Design a protein around this ligand. Structure first.
Ligand SMILES: [Zn+2]
Lengths: 52, 48, 105, 49, 100, 49, 58, 193, 49
């Protein structure tokens, strides 16, 4: 049918998330992170983990 | 249980009056206890 | 001194009008003019404002992209712990709005 | 989001003179699917629970 | 513009309603241990930024010590505003409070 | 004007120079109410917690 | 640039502005110029030019 | 249905006589919340003047909507609401964190507020084929763009010439099109049609 | 925190509430629509995160 060939979103999302996850992970793989100091005298550290 | 109490505050459209020690630390306000329990003003001459 | 001044003390902009510390930015001025501090929430896109008296020059500001705005000039600076900005940011992700009442008005 | 914006695009290109009574069930099926998975992606972002 | 005037009048009116007049004061005539510390610190801060000083330094280089000296001679031009829990307040001059 | 100057890389002469301009007047109306600050070492006059 | 040291935190007009006659503008310029005698210098210089015009000159 | 339009200049500039121009000089009372540096603790009025008011002189100010010419009758509002407006001893609340005070003040401002529509006179100081440059009250910049000058006016090498073939000079009368205020100095956009 | 940078404005209370989709759209600096975050040269993808 016509409405039977409407895209079933969740199933398409699987493929689309996979290729985006791969793409995004590889982009970040050779990113280059630049030092940022405050006027304070303070390096700013890029980490998402207060592991105290 | 941060998000629970937060959810409650939002649904009450609550105002935090900022009187508790915790709240003032959150917003960076000088504490109400002790040396924060009064204001200081300067007496200045020649004011007319 | 310990939990603010010597930790994450930060002078930050607020909009006195909507009470936000997240919707302010520096204006981007024409060369020769000086940058000012403005609220993205409280100001109209320039077009939409025309479409509703004359509009003063000091009341228009622009961003980097180039869009012109009218209003949103009721800003100051307050001293807050930086982590407050993070909390407010997370809350707005969840659809929640903090509104700081600042004095003097 | 992009994927739903496409479902919504094909949905408008249905003429109701071809739209069955049975197509009513399938269109609903596709719509439920979209709502559920967008709602899941939002949930996942705000409360992983 | 007309209504900022109104806003100011309201502010100033409520401020006057909160102020407990001098002769109706009812709190301790002693300076509290808290009031003392803050008075010293704050006056020291003002000294560090070239406030006119009301006493002979006699070689002192610590602004806190200068403040202490000023306190001792009762030459600190500061006033403590004590708040009762309803927000009304009593103004007490540093010189008039008994210090110990 | 709020800016900091490091004494770290410096020779004795450069330091002697900066030490002689600690108390120069204001050449700027906007900062005229301020004085310089020296980030001195902690010493025996001091109090810690 | 602007800090809490050189700029009011907020300014509000308390009344509607009242227009002033030339004779008043002149009496004010007069006294304001006298009382104030680098940015201020170059400014009273300009005021001096304005008071000149209000008397009709070059 | 929505009114931000309650920032519309409700002090219209009147036309004059014996004359034809608009008087734009106005006296407005203000309140202002300002810092007082510790060095001024014995001279608070002096300090308010040198820190805040003096820097306003001959600059455009967004709030009074004009150029501030000067000021009269500065008064500090005592934080002690119980004192008489008389006394020369006043209270100024000190910041918790810093030695600075902050007080309210009342003062009177004299303001040159040319709004759009007003009729002004300028002294011509420059004439290109692109604009006429004037100086109002021998102090503030004006400029009439090439196509705000009427169509039958002509140019030469240079200097402008009017409808009847005679050159223009010195005093010129124009109406306010827009007032640019954000630059280094105020500048008026004027028209002749 | 610097004793020579005083602050005049003071926060006196905080109100809790809900962001409307109208507010958000108005204040927003950019609508984000691309799942992809970087390109082959490590630059931000336009309309991306
Ligand atoms: Zn706002």
């Amino acid at each position: 049918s016509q409405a039977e060939s409407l895209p079933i979103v969740s199933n398409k999302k699987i493929v689309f998330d996979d290729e985006v996850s791969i793409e995004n992970k590889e982009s970040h793989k050779e990113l280059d992170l630049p030092e940022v100091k405050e006027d304070n005298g303070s390096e700013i550290v890029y980490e998402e983990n207060t592991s105290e | 249980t941060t998000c629970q109490f937060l959810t409650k505050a939002v649904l009450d459209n609550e105002r935090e009056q900022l009187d508790s020690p915790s709240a003032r630390i959150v917003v960076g306000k000088l504490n109400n206890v002790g040396t924060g329990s009064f204001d200081v003003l300067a007496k200045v001459p020649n004011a007319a | 001194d310990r939990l603010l001044n010597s930790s994450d003390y930060t002078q930050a902009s607020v909009c006195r009008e909507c009470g936000s510390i997240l919707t302010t930015q520096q204006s981007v001025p024409r060369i020769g003019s000086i940058s000012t501090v403005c609220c993205r929430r409280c100001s109209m896109r320039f077009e939409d404002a025309k479409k509703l008296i004359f509009i003063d020059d000091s009341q228009i500001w622009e961003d980097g992209q180039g869009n012109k705005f009218v209003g949103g000039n009721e800003t100051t600076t307050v001293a807050i712990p930086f982590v407050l900005k993070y909390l407010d940011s997370e809350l707005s992700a969840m659809g929640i709005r903090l509104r700081y009442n600042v004095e003097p008005k | 989001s992009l994927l739903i914006r496409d479902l919504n695009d094909d949905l408008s290109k249905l003429q109701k003179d071809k739209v069955s009574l049975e197509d009513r069930r399938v269109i609903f099926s596709r719509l439920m699917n979209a709502f559920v998975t967008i709602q899941n992606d939002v949930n996942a972002f705000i409360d992983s629970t | 513009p007309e209504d900022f005037q109104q806003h100011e009048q309201i502010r100033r009116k409520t401020l006057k309603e909160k102020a407990i007049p001098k002769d109706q004061r009812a709190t301790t005539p002693y300076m509290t241990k808290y009031e003392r510390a803050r008075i010293l610190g704050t006056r020291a801060l003002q000294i560090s930024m070239n406030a006119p000083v009301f006493v002979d330094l006699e070689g002192e280089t610590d602004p806190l010590r200068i403040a202490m000296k000023e306190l001792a001679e009762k030459k600190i031009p500061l006033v403590i505003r004590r708040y009762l829990p309803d927000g009304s307040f009593e103004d007490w001059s540093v010189e008039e409070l008994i210090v110990d | 004007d709020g800016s900091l100057v490091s004494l770290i890389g410096m020779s004795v002469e450069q330091r002697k120079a900066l030490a002689n301009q600690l108390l120069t007047p204001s050449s700027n109306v906007s900062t005229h109410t301020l004085n310089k600050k020296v980030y001195r070492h902690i010493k025996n006059r001091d109090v810690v917690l | 640039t602007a800090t809490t040291l050189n700029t009011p935190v907020v300014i509000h007009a308390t009344q509607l502005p009242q227009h002033v006659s030339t004779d008043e503008v002149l009496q004010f310029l007069e006294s304001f110029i006298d009382e104030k005698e680098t940015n201020l210098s170059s400014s009273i210089s300009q005021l001096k030019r304005i008071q000149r015009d209000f008397k009709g000159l070059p | 249905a929505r009114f931000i339009k309650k920032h519309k200049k409700q002090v219209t500039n009147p036309i004059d006589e014996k004359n034809g121009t608009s008087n734009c000089i106005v006296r407005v009372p203000i309140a202002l919340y300002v810092s007082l540096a510790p060095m001024y603790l014995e001279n608070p009025l002096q300090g308010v003047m040198k820190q805040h008011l003096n820097p306003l002189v001959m600059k455009y100010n967004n709030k009074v909507g004009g150029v501030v010419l000067g000021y009269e009758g500065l008064k500090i509002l005592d934080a002690d609401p119980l004192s008489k407006e008389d006394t020369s001893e006043k209270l100024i609340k000190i910041t918790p964190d810093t030695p600075f005070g902050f007080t309210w003040c009342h003062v009177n401002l004299y303001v040159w507020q040319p709004q759009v529509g007003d009729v002004l006179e300028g002294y011509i100081f420059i004439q290109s084929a692109s604009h006429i440059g004037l100086l109002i009250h021998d102090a503030f910049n004006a400029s009439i763009k090439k196509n705000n000058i009427p169509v039958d006016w002509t140019f030469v090498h240079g200097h402008w010439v009017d409808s009847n073939g005679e050159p223009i000079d010195g005093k010129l009368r124009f109406t306010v099109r827009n007032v640019h205020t954000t630059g280094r100095v105020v500048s008026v956009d004027g028209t002749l049609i | 925190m610097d004793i020579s940078k005083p602050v005049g404005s003071e926060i006196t209370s905080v109100d809790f509430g809900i962001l409307t989709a109208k507010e958000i759209r108005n204040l927003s600096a950019k609508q984000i629509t691309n799942p992809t975050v970087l390109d082959n040269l490590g630059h931000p993808v336009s309309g991306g995160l």
